Amino acid sequence: FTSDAKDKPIGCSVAISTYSMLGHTTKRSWEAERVMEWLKTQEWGLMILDEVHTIPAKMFRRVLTIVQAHCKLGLTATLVREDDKIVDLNFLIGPKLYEANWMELQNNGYIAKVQCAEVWCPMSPEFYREYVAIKTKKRILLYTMNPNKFRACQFLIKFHERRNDKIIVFADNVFALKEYAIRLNKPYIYGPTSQGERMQILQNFKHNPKINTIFISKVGDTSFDLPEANVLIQISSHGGSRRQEAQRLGRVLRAKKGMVAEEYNAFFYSLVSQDTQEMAYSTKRQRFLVDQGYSFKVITKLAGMEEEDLAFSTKEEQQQLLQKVLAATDLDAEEEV
Amino acid sequence: RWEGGYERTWEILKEDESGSLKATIEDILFKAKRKRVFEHHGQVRLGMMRHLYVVVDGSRTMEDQDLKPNRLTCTLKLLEYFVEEYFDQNPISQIGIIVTKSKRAEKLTELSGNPRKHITSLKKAVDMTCHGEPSLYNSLSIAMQTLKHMPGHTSREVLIIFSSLTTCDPSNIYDLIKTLKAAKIRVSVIGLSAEVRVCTVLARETGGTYHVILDESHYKELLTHHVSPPPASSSSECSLIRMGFPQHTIASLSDQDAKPSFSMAHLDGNTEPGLTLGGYFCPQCRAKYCELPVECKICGLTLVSAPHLARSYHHLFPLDAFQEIPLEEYNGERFCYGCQGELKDQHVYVCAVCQNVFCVDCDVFVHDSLHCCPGCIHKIPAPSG
Amino acid sequence: SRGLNRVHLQCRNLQEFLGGLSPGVLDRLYGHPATCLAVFRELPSLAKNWVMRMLFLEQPLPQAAVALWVKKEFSKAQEESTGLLSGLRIWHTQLLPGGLQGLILNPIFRQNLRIALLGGGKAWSDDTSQLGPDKHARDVPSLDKYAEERWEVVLHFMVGSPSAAVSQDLAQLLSQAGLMKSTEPGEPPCITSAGFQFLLLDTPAQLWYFMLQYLQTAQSRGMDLVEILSFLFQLSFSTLGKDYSVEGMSDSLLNFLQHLREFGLVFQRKRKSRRYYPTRLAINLSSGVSGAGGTVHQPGFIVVETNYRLYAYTESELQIALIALFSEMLYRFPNMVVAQVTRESVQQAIASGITAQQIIHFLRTRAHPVMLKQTPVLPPTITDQIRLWELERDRLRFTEGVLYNQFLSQVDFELLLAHARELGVLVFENSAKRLMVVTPAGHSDVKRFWKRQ
Amino acid sequence: VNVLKGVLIECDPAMKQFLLYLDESNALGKKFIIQDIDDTHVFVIAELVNVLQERVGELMDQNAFS
Ligand SMILES: [Zn+2]
Ligand SMILES: [Zn+2]
Ligand SMILES: [Zn+2]
C-alpha cells in the first residue's frame, strides 16, 4: 500500500503499509482515504513496526493518532535514539520484551563474525599541501580521489578473489567511484541507474559465482536493495550518523563460507585519510566501534604492496589523476542529500 | 504466570544465607559438585598389543553443535590427544583409522603406529563434510578382511565413533554377531549423546563395552577408560614370536664415510621414500632404514625395541592402592613422605604396605605419572628375596 | 631529539662508569662486597660460564681454545659475549705465555671472588661488624609501609604534594638532576621533563644513579665506599644491628645514611642511630629487571578490553597519582575507572616522549596479579594502537649538521665523501645534487682539511 | 663551499612537503627552509624547532578539525 501499489484495496486480509507521514492538503485523495478507511477495516490488526528509531516524535504523534490499534510490534534494533531523554518509548508501545545477545548469535549461531577495519593509509603529499592551502570543499575531494586509497582498493579485490567469496565496496560519491569502475572495471551502480539492469546486476552478483565483486552508491543501500554478501569495503565516512552507517554493514554481511574454524569470516573495511577529517572522524568512529565492541583492527600497510601489479605505481600517473582533480568541481563531492 | 515463573527459577538460587556471608555456600556446592569417578581398576588377564580400529560416523548429526561448533570438533581434536596418549601408554599396538562417509567406509589410515601419519590424517579430517548416512556393515567388512589376515595371536578390538543415528546398512549385521564372535574380534562403540539398542545389543553380544557421550569431560573419561588394554575374552593366545631385536647403526663404525647416504635403492632396508645415512638395523632382512620401533615389510617381523614398548605395560599392571584418612598421626613434622608439605584437607594418603603419608599432589603424581609408590622402594628391595 | 639513555642503562652502569674511569679506580671496585655486583648486572649466559673456569684456572688458558669453545652456531653471540667481558677490564690478555696470547682474568678479583665462592671469614664475611639480630624490637611489614610511603613522599612531591616532604637537600639535587627544577623566587619543586619520565619508570635504580651522581657534585668521599654500601644494602632485610653500622662505620657511611632514611631505604631511630635497617627494596635494585617479586602491592587483574582502560580496585593515591598524569577527564567513583582517550593519554606522553615499554611495564604493573589467568597477548591490537599513537606525534628527528652544497667538482666530492667516511662525521650524502650531511662537531676537521688540500 | 648550520629533520614525505606550507604560513619569511634534499631531509634555521616540536601537531590537528 505505498507508491501507487494499490494492491488489493477491496478486501483487506493481511496488509503491508507505510507510515503515512503526510499531513498534507489532499495528498492522496482516495488512496490515503483508503489508507484511512481500511485502517478502520483493519480494526486493530497488528502494528508491525520496523526500527522506530527512524520514527520522529512528531511521527510518533501519528503513530497513536492515526493508528489506534490494540497490539503493537516494535522491530527496532536501536535501544536509545535521537538524544531525546524527555519522551521515552514504553508509553508508545508498552514493554520492550526481548533483545538477543550478539555472543549467542555470533559465536553460537548463524551470524558471522565481522572483522571491522578502519584502514588509514599514508597518502601522497601532493594531495595535502593543496588541501591545507584551500579551505574550500574541493579539499574534501582531494583525499577522496587518492591512488593511495586505490592501492588499498586494488589490493583486497585480488586478495579476496583468492578465497572466491563475495565482496562489496561502498564509496561516497559517483565520479570518483566511477573511475574505480573505469580503472579496474567492476559491477557498479549510481543514482539514476535503471532498476531492471540493477536487478540483473543482483543476478550477476548474488547468483553468478564468476564475479564476486560489485560497487554500490548512496542509493543502493538505502532505496533499492538489501545486498547479501560476505566482505564489505567502505570509503564514505563524513557524516555523524553512526548507526545508520553501522546498520548498513549489519544488514549486508552474511556468512562467508561453511567455515569449520571459529574465526571471523564476515569482513568490514574502511578507507581513512590520514591527517584529515577522515582521520578525525574515524577516531570518534572507532570510538563508536568500541562503544558497541566488535572484532576491530586498524591496519595501515598491505600484505605486500608491490606483490600485486599496482596501478598508479608511478606518481606521474597519479599526476594524471591529479590534473583531473584539478579539473574537478564540487559536483563530484556531494551525496544524495 | 510465566514472567513470574521464569524468575521463580532464579530467585531462590540467587538467595542464600543472608545477613553476613552471602554468595558463599553457593561456591561450596560447586566444590561439592566436583569429585567424579576415580579409577575403579584392579584387573588381570588380558590386554596386550591391541589392533585398534577407529571407525568414524560421518553423518548429518555432526551439524548439531551440542558441545562444540561441530561434533567432529568435539571428536577429532581429542582423538589426536587420544592417539598421543595411546602411543604414550601402548606402543605395542597399532590403530586402523577407518572413516564411514556417505553409506560406505574408507579405511583412511592403515593399521599402523606412526603418529604423525595418523595425526595429519586427523588434520586432514578437519574439513570433512560428513555427507550421507552411517554404514557399519562396510566398516565391519574392512574390519573383517583386514584382521582376517592378522594372526590369532593378535588382540582384536574395534573402536567405533558413532553419532547415535540410524545404523543405515543392509546385509544382516545381526548375523555379523556369529561372524565376529567366531572371528574373536571385539567391537567397542560409544554413542554420541544417545543410544542405539541394536548397537547396544551388538556390544553386549560382543564383550566390547558400550557407552553414551555425556559431556566433553565425560568424553575424555571413556577415552581414558579405553586407553588401557582391556581384559578381553579368554582363549585368544599366549605367545608371539620372532620379536626382532634391532641394532642402532652409527654409520661410522669401521669405514668412516664410505657411503654418502645409506639409502640408494639397493641397501638392505631403505624402505620409505626419503634419503638416509644409516641409523638402524633389523636382524632378519638386516634392514637399515629410518628408525622405527614397530615392524617391517620384508623381514615382516616385529621390530621390537624393548626399553620403550616392552617397558610400557611392563609396569602398568602390577599396581596397588593407597588409603585415605582424615586423622592426624602427624608423620614427619606434619609433612609428606613425598613432596614434604601440608595443607590438611583431611586426605592423609597412606600406603597399603609401606604406609607412607602423601597428599593429593603426591597421590595424583603416583596415580597418573609415577604409577607406583616409591615408599615401597627402600621397603621392598632391602629384604627382597 | 629527546634523551632515551636516562631510563635504563643497566649494564653500562657497571661499564660506562667503570670504563669511564681508571683501572686503579675500578681496582677499588674489587672490594669483596663488590664481587656479587659484577656477576649479576651483566646478564650473558655465555660469559657467565667463561668465569666459571677461572676459580679452577690459575693458568692463562690459550685464547683459541675458548675462541673455539663454541663452533658455527652463534659465533656472533660468542663474540658479543666476549669483548664486553673484556670491556669490563677484568681480563688480562697475556702476550706469549707458551707461544701465543692466552687470556686470563685479573687475579685480585679472583682473590675477591673466591672468598665469595668458598670459605673466608673475612671482613665482609665476619670478624669486624657485619650484621646483628639481637631481639626483635621492630618488624618488617610495618617497615614495608615505610618502604612504601617514602616512595610516595618521593613520588608525590615530585608531582607536588598538598602535604609536604621532609627537610632534604635532595630536592636541590633533584632540581639539579633535571628531573625537577625550581625558578628562583620561593624555589618551586616542579618537574622539568625527566622526573615525569621517572614517574613513568618504577625501579630504584634511577635513585641509585643520582646516588651514584651524589658524589659527582663536587663531593669528595668514598665512591668506593657507597657502591660497596650499595651492595651492602642488597642483603634482603631482617637485621637491626647492635648499632652494627656504627661498629662498621665510616664518614660518608653514616652521613649519607641520614639520607637513606630520606631515601627511606634505611630506617633510623632516635639520634639517627643505635641500629640499622635494610628494606626488602634491597633486591630490585640488584637487578633493575622487572621481577615477579617486584609487585609492590597486589591489587588484582586488569584488562584493556575495547581499549577503554577497563579496571577497578580502589588503590592508594599514588596509583591515582600514577594515572592523574595518565587518565583524567571522565574519571569515575570508587573503583578507579577513568575512561580512555586516544589523544589525551597520547598528549600525556608529549612531556615524556614515548613510554613504549613503560606502557607495557605499567600494563603489567597497573593491577599486578593480571598475568595469573589472562592471555599472553594482553593487548591484542592495543599495543600497536599505543605504538601508532606514539608513532603519530613523533614527526621530527632533531639533528643539527653541516651541509656541503655547490661543490666545485664531482670526483673530489667523492674524495671528501671518502674523507668524511674515513672520519665518520658524515650522516648522509646526496651525490645526485653533490650534498653531504656532515656533523658540525666534525666540521672543523674537514674545514681544516679543505683549507689545506 | 657554503657552511650550512641548519638542522636536519627526517620524516615522511607526507610531512616533508608540509613544512613548505609551514614556511609559506610562517609568520616571518623563510627560515624553516634552508634547502631540502629530495623527499625525507630538510634544513631549518634553529630558532623555534623546540617550539615546532609542538607547534606542528597543534596546527595539523586543528586544520583537519575543520
Ligand atoms: Zn628379514
Ligand atoms: Zn603428598
Ligand atoms: Zn610405598
What does this structure look like?
Chain A is 38% helix and 10% strand. Chain A is an alpha/beta fold and 337 residues long. In chain A, strands 3, 4, 5, 6, 7, 8 and 9 form a 7-stranded parallel beta sheet that branches. Chain A has a two-stranded parallel ribbon with strand order 1-2. Chain A is globular and about 70 Å long. In chain B, helix 7 links the parallel strand 4 and strand 5. The radius of gyration of chain B is 26 Å and the shape is globular. In chain C, 37% of the residues lie in helices and 4% in strands. Chain C contains 21 helices and 6 strands. Chain C has helices spanning 23-27, 34-41, 47-50, 63-67, 75-80, 83-87, 107-115, 140-159, 171-174, 194-199, 205-212, 223-233, 244-247, 251-262, 284-287, 317-324, 344-347, 356-363, 382-393, 411-423, 443-452; strands at 91-93, 103-105, 399-400, 402-403, 426-430, 435-438. In chain C, a hairpin with a 4-residue loop joins strand 5 (426-430) and strand 6. The longest helix of chain C is centred in the N-terminal third of the chain and has 20 residues, at 140-159. Chain C is globular and about 80 Å long. In chain D, strands 1-2 form a two-stranded antiparallel ribbon. Chain D is 41% helix and 12% strand. Chain D is built from 4 helices and 2 strands. By secondary structure, chain D is α+β, with helices and mostly antiparallel strands. The interface between C and D is medium-sized, with 25 and 24 residues. Strand 3 (399-400) of chain C pairs antiparallel with strand 1 (7-10) of chain D. The structure holds zinc ion (3 copies). The site of one zinc ion has 6 residues of chain B, from loops. One zinc ion is lined by residues 336, 338-339, 358-359, 361-362 of chain B. Chain D: Keywords: Cytoplasm, Disease variant, DNA damage, DNA repair, Ichthyosis, Nucleus, Phosphoprotein, Transcription, Transcription regulation. Chain D: Belongs to the TFB5 family. Chain D: InterPro entries: TFB5-like_sf, TFIIH_TTDA/Tfb5. Chain D: It is found in: Nucleus; Cytoplasm. Chain D: One of its GO terms (cellular component) is nucleolus.
